[PDB]
């Protein structure tokens, strides 16, 4: 082949975190929501198999799996923590997935709610024709 391909796809990782009007019985002071998505409502499901959100051990059923959009977790809690995220690809070769450490931080009562956005670029060199077709639908 004379030809070669590099494909780039953009992901957005983010979260919202808000102080509750009233704490929960466990003493969870905050509502939050973390997510993985494409920018401008683009459809990353063409190439994403699933998104795994690994919550802090203090949460029940800490491995949260989303096989279909929206890839998000909504929860309540009292403290910020590092939240590993795995994005799995509909790829039959390497790489099968990419891993991020997401910083799920909360702000103190009195400060505006958290609305955080983290942009990530993924680059795939010479994907298979099957995977390439999926990436370029997104």
């Amino acid at each position: 082949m004379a030809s070669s391909c590099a494909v780039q796809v953009k992901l957005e990782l983010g979260h919202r975190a808000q102080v509750r009007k009233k704490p929960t019985v466990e003493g969870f002071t905050h509502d939050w929501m973390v997510f993985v998505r494409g920018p401008e409502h683009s459809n990353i499901q063409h190439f994403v198999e699933k998104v795994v959100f690994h919550l802090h051990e203090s949460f029940p059923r800490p491995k949260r799996v989303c096989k279909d959009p929206p890839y998000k977790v909504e929860e309540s809690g009292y403290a910020g923590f590092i939240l590993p995220i795995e994005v799995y690809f509909k790829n039959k070769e390497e790489p099968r997935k990419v891993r991020f450490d997401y910083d799920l931080f909360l702000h103190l009562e009195g400060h505006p709610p958290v609305n955080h956005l983290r942009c990530e670029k993924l680059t795939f060199n010479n994907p298979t024709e099957d995977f390439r077709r999926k990436l370029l639908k997104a």
């Binding site: 002071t29 009292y78 910020g80 923590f81 931080f105 909360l106 702000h107």
Partner: peptide, 8 residues
């Protein structure tokens, strides 16, 4: 800092 405490 604006942040709450953290857990680990």
């Amino acid at each position: 800092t604006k942040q709450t405490a953290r857990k680990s």
